[PDB]
Amino acid sequence: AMKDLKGTKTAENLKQGFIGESMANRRYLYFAKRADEEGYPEIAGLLRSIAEGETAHAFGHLDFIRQGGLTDPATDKPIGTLEQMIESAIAGETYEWTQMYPGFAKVAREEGFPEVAEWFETLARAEKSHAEKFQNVLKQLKG
Amino acid sequence: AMKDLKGTKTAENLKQGFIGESMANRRYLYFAKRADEEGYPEIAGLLRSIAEGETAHAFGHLDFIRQGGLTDPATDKPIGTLEQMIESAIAGETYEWTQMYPGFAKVAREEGFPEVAEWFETLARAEKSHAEKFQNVLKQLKGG
Ligand SMILES: [Cl-]
Ligand SMILES: [Cl-]
Ligand SMILES: [Fe+3]
Ligand SMILES: [Fe+3]
Ligand SMILES: [Fe+3]
Ligand SMILES: [Fe+3]
Ligand SMILES: [O-]
Ligand SMILES: [O-]
């Protein structure tokens, strides 16, 4: 491992860097599909390659987070070992299906956006499925 | 009106949902590499397949964001047209190389983490390159 990063500004900067790099990869792949449709294959290919750069950046942020004794940016749980990684996935998916997406759906219906609410409700069910599958992984790793 | 979401709580929830889904895909692909090394191909395959689910979720959030007249979660810029998408990329990468990563690197050096600082400095130069590449894309879309 490396030097303990707990309590530093650098620890928070690695977290914020990870968030930005994660968004960037998703955004650029989404933009590339628009270039695909419109017939700009060289632009689309460049966007996809830049997206690979943002993957490398996000993974590198996680390397320093992990080696510096810090927790998962998304869940505040340790991600040193594979079992811990799966436990972090479980915690995040559980938050999403028990709290986040059901709340998003309720608000969307209150604000008069039932189609968006249906989407959030679909996702709530999907994250519960994800959580159950990750829990099956953990039981098998621990057995 | 689902086509005008501006100023609503649903607008903020779509943004936060996109952020979480984006992180989830990155996290699960990263975790899959550990399963790969240790010889857990079924676990790695599950992580990768669930990661595809989180991609679909993130992209769907962006669909509703764009259809509702909302802005890019990362830059607060419109992303309706391809040119707007590229202009959002330029703005974000420019912020990253002129301000964010240089500031992160300075803090890392002052806090005694030179390896992290060097990483942030590498990324600052990388985002400058990315910004220039997106700038070229825009020139090409405009006729260049
Ligand atoms: Cl092209
Ligand atoms: Cl396996
Ligand atoms: Fe980057
Ligand atoms: Fe999820
Ligand atoms: Fe999801
Ligand atoms: Fe970037
Ligand atoms: O980035
Ligand atoms: O998710």
Author numbering:
A (entry chain B): 0 to 142
B (entry chain A): 0 to 143
Paper text:
One such protein is sulerythrin (SulE), a ruberythrin-like protein isolated from the thermophilic archeon Sulfolobus tokodaii. SulE lacks the characteristic C-terminal, rubredoxin-like FeS4 domain of ruberythrins and contains a binuclear metal centre that coordinates iron and zinc when isolated from S. tokodaii. In contrast to other members of the ruberythrin family, a crystal structure of native SulE shows that it forms homodimers through domain swapping, with each monomer contributing two α-helices to give two four-helix bundles that each harbour a solvent-accessible, single dimetal site. The exact function of SulE is unknown, but it is presumed to be involved in reactions against oxidative stress.
